[PDB]
Amino acid sequence: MATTYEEFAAKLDRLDAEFAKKMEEQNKRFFADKPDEATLSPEMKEHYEKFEKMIQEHTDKFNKKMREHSEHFKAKFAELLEQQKNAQFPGK
User: Fold this and answer.
1) Contact 13, 51 (CB under 8 A)
2) Which of 2, 23, 45, 58 is deepest in the core (most CB within 10 A)?
3) How far apart are CA 33 and CA 55, in angstroms?
4) E strand or H helix at 27
5) In terms of C-beta density within 10 A (0-12 exposed, 13-18 middle, 19 or more buried), how is residue 18 classed?
6) What are the disulphide bonds in this sequence?
7) Is 56 exposed, middle or buried (0-12, 13-18, 19+ CB in 10 A)?
8) Helix-strand-coil percent breakdown of the chain, rounded to 5?
9) Rounded to whole angstroms, how far apart are CA atoms 29 and 32?
């Protein structure tokens, strides 16, 4: 279900606010590698790999300026999963 992420990661690349600060937490993937029930797949680890490359490229500094709108972006994560989940299930 990486789609939900592949769809948001495409539009978030223009914000580098949340996704930019979320990728930096990748290092935590180790300390938090432990099982959390969800046992999510690397579906997001394969796509997010395209964002990190932007961090050191410039996004790292962008997240500082776009951080002003990161308030509404950090929330998008909630709808991110609904983006596709809803895109392939028209009802509500």
Assistant:
1) yes
2) 23
3) 22
4) none
5) buried
6) none
7) exposed
8) 75, 0, 25
9) 5
Nearest to 17 by CA among 80, 63, 64: 63
CA 72 vs. chain centroid, Å, equals 14
Question: CA 4 → CA 9, 48, 62, 78, 88, distances in Å?
Answer: 9, 12, 23, 11, 11
| Total residues belonging to the chain | 92
The residue with tokens 């609904």 is 82
| Distance from C-alpha of 49 to C-alpha of 33, rounded to nearest angstrom | 17
Dig out the tokens for 56 from the structure: 């050191």
Rounded CA separation 59/51 (Å): 9
What the block records as the tokens of 91 is: 């009802």
